[model samples]
Target: TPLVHVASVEKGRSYEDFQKVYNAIALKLREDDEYDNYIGYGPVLVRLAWHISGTWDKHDNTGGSYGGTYRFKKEFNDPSNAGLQNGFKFLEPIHKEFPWISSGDLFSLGGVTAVQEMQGPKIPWRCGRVDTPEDTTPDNGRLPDADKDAGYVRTFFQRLNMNDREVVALMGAHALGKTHLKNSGYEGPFGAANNVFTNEFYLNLLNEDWKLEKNDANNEQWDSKSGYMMLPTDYSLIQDPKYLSIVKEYANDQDKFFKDFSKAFEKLLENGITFPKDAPSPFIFKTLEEQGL
Candidate 1:
């Protein structure tokens, strides 16, 4: 009685086909600078990819990037996913044009394309996430809460089976977007360049003299004199000695951070997926600049 979900490449698609999808997403990321106070949809697209994939439970494999369950209203309306509708809307046209790609593949690829276009690392991506039935969607409350501590963050990610290094690397993505008081009740960017991916999140955590403050949402968050902010969970990285060491490592070494982030991110998206031995290898797409498009 084995019920494994193995990846099956979409019937006639190849690397070239997915590259077209990547190029389209990259072009749209460049063109859509008006989003989120001009920080663009890049960060949120990454957020979309994370949320879509983050729901996976390594114990049961009930959720993850495989099913594209976020399309269904239950997953869409999760309180944790409030601001992601923007990411969804941003990709709607791309989906409209490339009608063949599965939503899971499109959502995850949107993240890889955004990171690369924003001057981040090249995240290798696999395509073949077939959307399952609406009833198969995982129930709400699977995502992490921002209003917690290091222990919570640690235990929560254990559900995804992410180790200390992987957890630290993934949290670096917090550097990419500003926090709206409306979304998750937190506010402020983790760094100056919200659209560009960098180890600045680690740098800021180590350097910033942060003070705890309550926001309009009546929630407490750590803030800096320079207008940056960190959630209790984000701040926990520095509070815990173990995570702090990894934070310092990433802060001091850009090459290491990028390589680690790329690996952890690809793994996060690939959770709950089973790739047959003959399945196509993961694709590392060229950035728009590389293609001179």
Candidate 2:
């Protein structure tokens, strides 16, 4: 009587099928050069993957990457999901070309491709998220608020069961994309090369002398003289002493940071699913350059 959705691999699909999908996403990421001032879709695709998977609630297992529910209006229209339509739209053609991949797998895989293409770490991924009905979509307000402090950040992520170190590692994703005022009411990039993934997020958090100011959106964010900005939640990493130590570790050791981020990101995308004992091992995709594409 213990019935849960045991993951079933999409019919006839294997590692090679998924590698083709990964190549498609990476190719488009390279070709679409005009997006966000030539940063292309990599950052937003990463953001999209995060937004889709971030709805998870570890307590009830109601939301998570397992359901693939973001396609529905209720979840798609979540105010927190503003600007993610671009990520979805960007994937439509890829999904069209490869109609077999589930929304959940495609979305999560997009994140993996974006990070590695941006020279981030190799995140191992497992597929098998079957699309669910519309009623399965989670309610809004599941994502974190940018304006909160370190303590709030801790409590919020605990629902996702992310520990202090995991929390610090995941926040490093802020290095990839700038926040648009219209989208999140917070603005500015975390670093100069927003398209490239680096330990710069942690480096900036430690090195920049930030001041509190109200942005044009009337939200209070920390600003650096170099024209970079951090959400109050971002600055909270330095405000709390424990988070500060990990932030320093990532700032100083690029290899450790990438390794930890890969682990946390894969965990973030894989939460709330019960992979069967016989499920295929997670796939580590080779980037296009490595494949000589």
Top-lDDT candidate index? 1
Candidate 1: stretches off by over 4 Å: 1-3
Superposed by TM-score, candidate 2 places the C-alpha of residue 197 at a distance from the truth, in angstroms, of 0.7
Tens digits of per-residue lDDT for model 1, 1-293: 32367888989999999999999998888887988788999999999999999999888778999989999999999999999999999999999999999999999999999999999999999998998999989899999998889999999999998999999999999899988888778878888999989999999999999999999999999999999999999999998999999999999998999999999999999998999999999999998898999
TM-score of every prediction relative to native: 0.98, 0.98
Tens-place lDDT digits, model 2, residues 1-293: 32255567999999999999999999999999899878789899999888888888876787888778889999999999999999999999999999999999999999999999999999999999888889889999999899889999999999888999999999999988899989999888878889999999999999988999998999999999999999999999998999999999999998999999999999999888888999999999999999999
Query: Where's the lowest-lDDT run of ten residues in candidate 1?
Result: 1-10
